[PDB]
Amino acid sequence: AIQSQEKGTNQLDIGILDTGTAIGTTQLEKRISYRDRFTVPEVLMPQQ
Amino acid sequence: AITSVDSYLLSEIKPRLNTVLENCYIIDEVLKDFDYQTRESFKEAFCGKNAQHEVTVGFNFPKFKNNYEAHYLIQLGQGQETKNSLGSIQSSYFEATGDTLVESSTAIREDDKLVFTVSKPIGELIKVEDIEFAKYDNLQVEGNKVSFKYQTNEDYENYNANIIFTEKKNDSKGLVKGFTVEEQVTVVGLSFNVDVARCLDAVLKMILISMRDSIEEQQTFQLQNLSFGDIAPIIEDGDSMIFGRPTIIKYTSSLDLDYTITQDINKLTFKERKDWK
């Protein structure tokens, strides 16, 4: 379960970057570890 | 002239960077002091014609995302005027002269002269490569052609040379008015891999050393001086940090204008007038 799915646009001398952040609640009995990675195949984001 | 150090650096760095990266043994020589694995990984990734990654160059503040794997960001800096001439007269000319040029050319026979043809009208000839003419050779320049006596030189009827010369704009008198400026540009090699940042630093220093011999910064942009910053995270709050090591390139150059003089005097005349008091 995922909440607060913010894009977090930044505009910099190097160019644009996304630093967005979200809050996730796991399933029971899981030990998520630092820099573990998630993808959400149902959800598509627009980019240019 | 008026000059733009940033656009000069962009125009000069991009082709040189490409021509080094397409040539494996050059990188193998530049990176000889690095750790073996750093060297081989860089050469595998970015170097040679088959390289799947690529480096990029551009000015700061673009509106789009860049290739943060390896990107040279060019960033126009400070400057100040340093030395002035009396009357601000940087020079004077009898014939409005353009940029300096070097062009390859070949001799041809024409009417028992040898001639070299050049793409533009020759305002001044500085050097015909590997030739010093005697008075007997009857060296003459006319329009966009250099001409050279055939009689004793028949062996050279197809000789290949480089001509160093400069354009003419027009036949006019004037004063070059201006001053010298000392100006800074910063360049930083961005990468999210620190070993790539260190290799991009090495490659950039090599490129600038090679650049010191170019006609552009021999005639203008003189006294290249380099300073180097710490390696640091440029951006720190992505999914990963982006690192870079700044370098500052400082140049001394002339800012000036062609003040043309329309006044010309072609005859004095004398008269005596009598004072009867």
Q: Shortest CB distance from A13 goes to which of B60, B64, B237?
A: B60
Distance of alpha carbon A31 from the chain centroid: 19
Contacts of B256 (CB under 8 A, 6+ apart): B1, B90, B176, B177, B178, B179
Contacts of A23 (CB under 8 A, 6+ apart): A2, A3, A4
Residues just before a chain gap in chain A (C–N exceeding 2.5 Å) are none
DSSP of chain B: ----HHHHHHHHHHHHHHHHHT-HHHHHHHTTTS-HHHHHHHHHHH-STT-SS--EEEES--SS---TTSEEEEEEEEEEEEE--GGGEEEEESSEEEEEEEEEEEEEEETTEEEEE-SS-EEEEEEETT----GGG--EEETTEEEEE-TT-GGGTT-EEEEEEEEEEES-EEEEEEEEEEEEEEEEEEBSSHHHHHHHHHHHHHHHHHHTTSHHHHHSSEEEEEEE---EEEE-SSSS-EEE-EEEEEEEEEEEEEEEE----------------
Cα–Cα distance, B158 to B137 (Å, whole number): 17
- Overall resolution, Å: 3.6
Cα–Cα distance, B141 to B121 (Å, whole number): 10
Cα–Cα distance, B4 to B23 (Å, whole number): 30
Q: Shortest CB distance from A17 goes to which of B73, B75, B235?
A: B235
Q: Shortest CB distance from B237 goes to which of A14, A15, A19?
A: A19
CB contact under 8 A, B235 and A12: yes
Q: What angle do CA B71, B57, B32 make, to 5 degrees?
A: 60
**Residue type, position B179, single letter:** F
CA atoms A38, A43, A45, A46: torsion sign:
positive
Distances (CA, A) of B114 to B68, B135, B156, B250: 55, 15, 9, 45
List residues bridging with B250 in a β-sheet.
B184, B225
Taking alpha carbons only, the member of B30, B9, B4, B16 closest to residue B73 is B9
Cα–Cα distance, A11 to A4 (Å, whole number): 21
Distance of alpha carbon B129 from the chain centroid: 19
Cα–Cα distance, A40 to B92 (Å, whole number): 71
Whether A45 has its CB under 8 Å from any CB of chain B: the answer is no
Residue B131 burial class via C-beta count within 10 angstroms: exposed 0-12, middle 13-18, buried 19 and up = middle
Q: Tokens 């180097």 map to which residue?
A: B228
Experimental method: cryo-EM
- Best residue in B59, B235, B236, B240 to probe A by mutation, most A CBs within 10 Å? B235
Distances (CA, A) of B113 to B83, B104, B108, B142: 47, 19, 8, 13
- Please state, as a whole number, how many other Cβ atoms lie within 10 Å of the Cβ of residue B196: 22
- Please state, as a whole number, how many other Cβ atoms lie within 10 Å of the Cβ of residue A9: 10
Cα–Cα distance, B77 to B79 (Å, whole number): 7
**Using an 8 Å Cβ cutoff, are B204 and B225 in contact?**
no
Q: What is the least distance, in Å, from the CA of A36 to any CA of chain B?
A: 11
State both tokens at B242. Answer: 């982006």
Strand B145-149 relative to strand A15-18, pairing:
unpaired
